[PDB]
Amino acid sequence: LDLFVSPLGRVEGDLDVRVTINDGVVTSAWTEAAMFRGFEIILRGKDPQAGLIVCPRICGICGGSHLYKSAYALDTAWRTHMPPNATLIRNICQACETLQSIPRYFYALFAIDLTNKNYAKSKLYDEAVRRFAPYVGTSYQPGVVLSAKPVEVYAIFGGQWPXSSFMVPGGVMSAPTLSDVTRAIAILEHWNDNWLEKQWLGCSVDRWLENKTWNDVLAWVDENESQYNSDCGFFIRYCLDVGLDKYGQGVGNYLATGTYFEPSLYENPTIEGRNAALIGRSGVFADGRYFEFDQANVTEDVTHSFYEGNRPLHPFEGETIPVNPEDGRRQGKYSWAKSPRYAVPGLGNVPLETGPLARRMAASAPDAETHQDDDPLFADIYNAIGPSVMVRQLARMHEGPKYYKWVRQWLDDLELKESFYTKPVEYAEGKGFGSTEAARGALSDWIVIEDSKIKNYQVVTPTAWNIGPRDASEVLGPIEQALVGSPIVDAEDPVELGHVARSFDSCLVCTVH
Amino acid sequence: SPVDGIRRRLDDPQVAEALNSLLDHADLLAVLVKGLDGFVRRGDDIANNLTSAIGELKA
Amino acid sequence: ASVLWFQGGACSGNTMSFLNADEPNVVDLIVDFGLDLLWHPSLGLELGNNAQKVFWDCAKGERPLDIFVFEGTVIEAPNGTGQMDMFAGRPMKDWVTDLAGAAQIVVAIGDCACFGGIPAMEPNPSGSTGLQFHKREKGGFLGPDFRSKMGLPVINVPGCPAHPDWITQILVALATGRAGDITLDDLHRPETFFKTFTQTGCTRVQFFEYKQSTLSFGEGTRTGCLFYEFGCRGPMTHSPCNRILWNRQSSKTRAGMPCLGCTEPEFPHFDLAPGTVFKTQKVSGMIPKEVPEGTDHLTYMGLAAAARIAAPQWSKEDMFVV
Amino acid sequence: ASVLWFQGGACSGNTMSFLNADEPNVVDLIVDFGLDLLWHPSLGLELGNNAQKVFWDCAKGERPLDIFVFEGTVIEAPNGTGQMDMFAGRPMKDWVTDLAGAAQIVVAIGDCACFGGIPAMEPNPSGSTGLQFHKREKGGFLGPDFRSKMGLPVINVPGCPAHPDWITQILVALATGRAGDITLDDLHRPETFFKTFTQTGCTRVQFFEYKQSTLSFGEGTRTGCLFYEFGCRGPMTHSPCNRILWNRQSSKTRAGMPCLGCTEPEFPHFDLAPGTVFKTQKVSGMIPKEVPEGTDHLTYMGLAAAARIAAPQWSKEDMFVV
Ligand code: FCO
Ligand code: F3S
Ligand code: F3S
Ligand code: F3S
Ligand code: F3S
Ligand code: F3S
Ligand code: F3S
Ligand SMILES: [Mg+2]
Ligand code: 3NI
């Protein structure tokens, strides 16, 4: 059965999903990013800092991430100096945007599908409906409402959220005051207490972060009624009951570009020094092995994308030349998403899943420096039960406590008397690579400044990694392979396709830009 | 064409004479506009000079 | 009051800003104010054919459509087909045509929808335009003479993104019987928000008054106004950004970021051409090319010189201190 | 960090304002920030001898007293006995002596406690004074040389009442290890709040800049600045009232009420003498008696004339429109 689902909403943009279904199981899948704005085209010839204004507009929910990586692209291109306070503010704001994204996405975009009639036979279905029904769910309302708090912190430092451009080469535009920091701390603590710990965890962030194995997580669910009946405990139990742990596996290979620089280690941003300075470590996890991320290994294939091109291009030489979707479909192209691939030795240019799960796998890599995220939890989960909708979601949710703790510490780390900005030299020429981990994963800018203008500007977003179509080798993108194997109880409401696509927290406006 | 008419005016002996006299003193016009550009680009300094002058009469 | 919120060439920032709503928050707006959110691409439960059923019922008049909110640009490329924005089996522009023709009120939220915004920046690959404007030029996709069924033009809630209150308070006004209190300016923006300027309530207006410039970002923004060195469009931009603070916390200008004039239809101004980003274009290095709204360069510069002379000492020192 | 909050000649407005705290709210401040509120007359559970036991343990050093918050004036009448303020078996001033001598930090919240405030208005029947100030004159009840055990003078959080953030953010700073970030001005006010003026962020500064006066209350406040006709002390008053809005909504000046300069030690200014309430005292009917801080009548008036002549049209029209 060929099933074309249009729209598949709650993916922050325009997504259609075509699936071949045999015996109630998806056997092949095509993700079709359906809306194109062409910001890379627009940025060409613009002011070298135009990215700081344009790139946040790639996406409402993760524009702060775009800003972060665009700023760092300029910082590397212009060989700027980043005062530690500026690095801290950038980290805080990136993480706060992610902390907003986590509940906002979980309740508003993902968890309402848990109320699908396909689960009516579950013993937890009534509770799932009570908690996660759209707009009236007892977990939905506070989760969504409180999701605005972390971006209040963002606004304290950046003026507003979404759509500040306050991260600039050489630091940040803002000069936090004491009350700024104290209020940011108060907002963060209130959000942590009222949503993260009270509602999501039913325990302290510290208690959750003590979970180092999948068995630890199950014991945590059963440990007491607070954790058992928390949104996290209920979600885990619901997933195990309704089978969200049984599909959406995907590629099983992961890309994290990392983000959150240790301020002392990235005072002078360079492409080469980026990985060592990361707190949230970069890392590629492919074929069960850890690899260092290298942006040089990134190509974008447009074979099945609505763009002209005949070979994968490293984004420094990237091109965004749209083809008319009618013609492209005549050529087998089906998506405005490019197909980002990563050259892994012994594997070729493979698709890599990006996102919190990719980050957790990277955090499980050996040889973490002291400043770096060293977390074996999702290595253990991956080895125990493997990837799935549930495990992907749990990675996303696991970042909540971890990032909250990091943000709280960074707010403590701010040295308010110290500089927030080192005026850079706006060089007429430069090649910049800025990367971050937006909520949904590796977000990267490759910028080429020439003649004091943007010569090239290539954005590769995490959902482009995940949802990008088949490459020249017809290798399905991570979301496409995750869709393959998904059960389809009801083709009229193929909610499992939504579960898989949304478990990646897909953002289609980011996918295409 | 109207542009043809401006070229026609340029032919006029009297118009031409005046335009030639303007180009004879174009150096003076250039220097006065350069002087104005200078004055404008040092307007902040002249404002600081008037501030220090008034600030003396204040003390 | 049924609400159908569609996204064209959008980044969903207006939706995300909207989700930051407080007093009312978004959930209370959707539930407790009688605003039946039929669907929203970021929030609607329905997918696929169920969602399309909702859309088609709205478009054909099978069910009433009181408010059609459109976010993002109306994408017309390629070649006016709109296929760079395919939504629910149609070019999004066709949905826009049908639903704008069906709605009692049409609200364009965000510059993209109002005026074309960032996607309409040259070279405008998506053929983006606003609902009733292309930049300042009235008409956009729906034409200058488009009126919704309540007789209103497209209500333009500009911004990039719009502040949540700019839409939520309009929605509350509509829901509380105060639609008649809503007056629109020449850009169809609610005058309750867009008679003020961004500068109105800016923490740096005293520095502006005394022509004290912020000189640098970061700690340099502990003083000064951003107009002179950072291209702040505050005094040329209608908005309540400093009256109704963003995220209930701040505003770009308060934080030290120049207002980019995003509520204005030309946004991004000068199409972010080289030398125009976070810079004040000046004539002869000292006269701003653009002076505040309603002033002329002569008077503005004379008053500026006088103010520089009269400037008190505190206006020359840090004020947003730790 | 133990906190003992006492009220002398107070109206409890600072407590009520404090209870309006958001980010942190008062409950989260008291519970989740490690601030052990030992007692508060409006909130403490203990009464009678149990409360007195708490007070005496703090006064005699039996239990640590980290922050002594004092609200209200130190009442010394009659005849320096302080018996117009008898609290828990003693004149309140005696409690003040003991607890201020015991506390690590002493915080006077509100003008009454900081400077004497309204009760210290002539004829001052209660013999009211501030902790370390009587109006602008340093020394108040505790003497100019009083220092708490952490070496600080009385931290004056002025206002009538103080805005909740003016105290809560200080308390958060103390609780989060940022006490060293707190700098105090010459009136011992936190400079993080009191380097700005009330005017800083006022929605009417553009009208001020162009010398466009609000002419009347009510709808008359849809335009204009209140300085010229309503005695707005905004430009002479240090406060973040327009930076950090009251009740997260507004400020007097935004709302159309003149700033009464309540964060200033002279408040109420001119002791509310006849003709000084909601009026600008003027010389020769044109020149304000008091000009903005750091300005001089001649440069102010010259700049004011220049601003009037160059005024844009919008500055002469309603801007805070319905
Ligand atoms: N998070 C996020 Fe948006 C996506 N995909 C970017 O980057
Ligand atoms: S917020 Fe986004 S939808 Fe358009 S108005 Fe700005 S690019
Ligand atoms: S007063 Fe404010 S709005 Fe801009 S022009 Fe100056 S920073
Ligand atoms: S850029 Fe826009 S959000 Fe307000 S501060 Fe300026 S009008
Ligand atoms: S609020 Fe009340 S306690 Fe004193 S400072 Fe004002 S009269
Ligand atoms: S600018 Fe505002 S603070 Fe008072 S003096 Fe005018 S109303
Ligand atoms: S009276 Fe006081 S509360 Fe603020 S507006 Fe003036 S300083
Ligand atoms: Mg790209
Ligand atoms: Ni996104």
Residue numbers in the entry:
A (entry chain A): 4 to 516
B (entry chain Q): 20 to 78
C (entry chain B), D (entry chain D): 2 to 323
Sentences from the paper on this structure:
Here we determined the cryo-electron microscopy structure of the Mycobacterium smegmatis hydrogenase Huc and investigated its mechanism. Huc is a highly efficient oxygen-insensitive enzyme that couples oxidation of atmospheric H2 to the hydrogenation of the respiratory electron carrier menaquinone. Huc uses narrow hydrophobic gas channels to selectively bind atmospheric H2 at the expense of O2, and 3 [3Fe–4S] clusters modulate the properties of the enzyme so that atmospheric H2 oxidation is energetically feasible. The Huc catalytic subunits form an octameric 833 kDa complex around a membrane-associated stalk, which transports and reduces menaquinone 94 Å from the membrane.
